[PDB]
Amino acid sequence: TLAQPGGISDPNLIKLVNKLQDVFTTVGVNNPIDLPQIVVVGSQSSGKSSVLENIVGRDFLPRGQGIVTRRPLVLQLINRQSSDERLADSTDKAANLDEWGEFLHLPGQKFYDFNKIRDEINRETEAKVGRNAGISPAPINLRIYSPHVLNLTLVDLPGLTRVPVGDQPRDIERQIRDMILKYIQKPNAIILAVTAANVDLANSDGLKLAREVDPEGQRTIGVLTKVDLMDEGTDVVDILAGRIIPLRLGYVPVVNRGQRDIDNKKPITAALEAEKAFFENHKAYRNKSAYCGTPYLARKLNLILMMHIKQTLPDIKQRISSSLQKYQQELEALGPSAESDYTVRRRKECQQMVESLQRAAEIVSQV
Numbered sequence: 001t002l003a004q005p006g007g008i009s010d011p012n013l014i015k016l017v018n019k020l021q022d023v024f025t026t027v028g029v030n031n032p033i034d035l036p037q038i039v040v041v042g043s044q045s046s047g048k049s050s051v052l053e054n055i056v057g058r059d060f061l062p063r064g065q066g067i068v069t070r071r072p073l074v075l076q077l078i079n080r081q082s083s084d085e086r087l088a089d090s091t092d093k094a095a096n097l098d099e100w101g102e103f104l105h106l107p108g109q110k111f112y113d114f115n116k117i118r119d120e121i122n123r124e125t126e127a128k129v130g131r132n133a134g135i136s137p138a139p140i141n142l143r144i145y146s147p148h149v150l151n152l153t154l155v156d157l158p159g160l161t162r163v164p165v166g167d168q169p170r171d172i173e174r175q176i177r178d179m180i181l182k183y184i185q186k187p188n189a190i191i192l193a194v195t196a197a198n199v200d201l202a203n204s205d206g207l208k209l210a211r212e213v214d215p216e217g218q219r220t221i222g223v224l225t226k227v228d229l230m231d232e233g234t235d236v237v238d239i240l241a242g243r244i245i246p247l248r249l250g251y252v253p254v255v256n257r258g259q260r261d262i263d264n265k266k267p268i269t270a271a272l273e274a275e276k277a278f279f280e281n282h283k284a285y286r287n288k289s290a291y292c293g294t295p296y297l298a299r300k301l302n303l304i305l306m307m308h309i310k311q312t313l314p315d316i317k318q319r320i321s322s323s324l325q326k327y328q329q330e331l332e333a334l335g336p337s338a339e340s341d342y343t344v345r346r347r348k349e350c351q352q353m354v355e356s357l358q359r360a361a362e363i364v365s366q367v
């Protein structure tokens, strides 16, 4: 299933939210948690779709050669607990009734087979922009339900290009740039600036665009793809050390599936093992290899999401404490437990509120 430790779907991460969500409910606070979006941005063919799908943990995004992603795909992960011929014709070994996808343009239809989700993304793409590299900003809206995911939104985007191809107009570059800016200009979006390691970092569209909207690198993570394709003897060590174009949140090198791996339908599990072995055996990456590969990028995102969840505790702690002192000061006047029917009931109301607020304050402390 989609539960994977260390990433955006870490089981402890989901449990933390549910515990805080009950705290918010006990105190009467609409959900204040506001998780950021995760957006891949970079030059065309840099491997953006592969990176984004690895964060989800299950394949569902079209990947390959040429111009592939030609419309924004806004994926909204939605947490839903558990409640067959519906999975009889499934070609996805990991299909289960607790996890499925829903497209906005196909209401009522559920996709338990993630290979069929990918097929529909490609189908819906061609239905709107054809089969000759046409691009459109109209997003494909996808909802994926699972008991193991957060209420998080991830965005796949077309890559920025230089020369129009096929049906693309002369100003396609500005159109794609403006398309991407819509999704990363928002203050909370986490920008995954994806650059292929087999091209000099100074040519990175992702880094240029990310630095325009996030000059201080408060929400930009560098992703260096295709490390396995670098010229023999060259490496990205100087980049990881912060010597070329420093990023506050740093860079993460990854090795995703090549085109032959795609044609052979190599499972993601075998691809992650091959990535791990690559860095552990490379003379330049054996050192601190735990900070290389897809698992480490998921750790950075996991920690950032923890930051935004915990970012709400201050206001909640102050609200619980101040509210607790208000009711305790009312219990002080009513006095210890013949008496007015109002006084007996108000004392009970205040007592119950104290017990609820005390139970809430301790839960926030144990986090």
Ligand SMILES: Nc1nc2c(ncn2[C@@H]2O[C@H](COP(=O)(O)OP(=O)(O)CP(=O)(O)O)[C@@H](O)[C@H]2O)c(=O)[nH]1
Pocket (backbone or CB within 6 Å): 043, 044, 045, 046, 047, 048, 049, 050, 051, 062, 063, 064, 065, 066, 067, 068, 069, 070, 157, 158, 159, 225, 226, 227, 228, 229, 254, 255, 256, 257, 258, 259, 260, 262
């Ligand atoms: N060797 C190798 N190939 C990779 C790696 N990442 C992606 N590729 C290959 O590069 C190509 C691009 O993959 P993809 O994830 O679709 O890239 P993209 O950035 O989304 C393409 P688009 O800009 O058109 O949306 C594919 O052939 C894929 O197999 C990597 O780390 N190593």
Ligand SMILES: [Mg+2]
Pocket (backbone or CB within 6 Å): 047, 048, 049, 050, 062, 068, 069, 156, 157, 158
């Ligand atoms: Mg893509």
